[PDB]
Amino acid sequence: FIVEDLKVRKGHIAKLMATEYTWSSLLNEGLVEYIDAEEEESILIAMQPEDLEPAKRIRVSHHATTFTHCEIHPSMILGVAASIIPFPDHNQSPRNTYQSAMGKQAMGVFLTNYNVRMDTMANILYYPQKPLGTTRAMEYLKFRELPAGQNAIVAIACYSGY
Amino acid sequence: FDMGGYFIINGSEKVLIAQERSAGNIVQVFKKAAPSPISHVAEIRSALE
Amino acid sequence: TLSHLRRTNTPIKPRQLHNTHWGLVCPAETPEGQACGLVKNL
């Protein structure tokens, strides 16, 4: 984003929502910018627009309103896969690095032409199931439309010690 | 749901993976090993791509 | 399949998650193999 006295606003929110009823809307309107890693040196971004301006998560502060830009949603640093972790902001960093390349070793609906496509080896699940635990990112990774597992009713406890 | 990107060469969907590299035709300088007769060095990766 | 289409073989510290790496590679999506964080997943 871009900051003065933050450009885009509820005008330009609706400005496109008829769509499914433009990225080049927000860049040529000078509302947004493509900052490589070198030009990242010369800039300041507030993580959350609202957060940094004037018993929940004890939150970062704002300070010196020298802000060039603002971060869209933090969640976009995530990767192609890991994007599917339910709340990685509550998990130890090495675990997240496993669920990451573990959803890559799974079972599920890999395409929909699975039946007339015929390739060497391939698994498909019998009753795929959109997870009861969804992150906004999923929408864009077309997950709920080709899940990978099933909402197992699960209980944790000792029993047979098996 | 297919999103493209891949070549189909004698049948098997092969991919290409980003081969990174320190950009060329740029300059930097790095003090070098304690026992070298050289204290720092100036490197430009000279290659018109 | 996506995660294979956004993979960056970084030929051969360089293995670490670097400060520059914010918002390009994944924080924690790399392989626990003999090239951990060498191949970075955009």
């Binding site: 929110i13 496109l16 769509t19 959350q48 627009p49 609202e50 | 493209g4 | 996506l2």
Partner: peptide, 30 residues
């Protein structure tokens, strides 16, 4: 009304657009 700022769920709609123009294998087509 166009004079009201931008919230959280506001930026989602943005991202939403981001892929509609570029998708998920951008770099690799392009």
């Amino acid at each position: 009304d166009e004079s009201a700022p931008i919230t959280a769920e506001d930026s989602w709609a943005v991202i939403s657009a981001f892929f509609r123009e570029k998708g998920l294998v951008s770099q690799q087509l392009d």
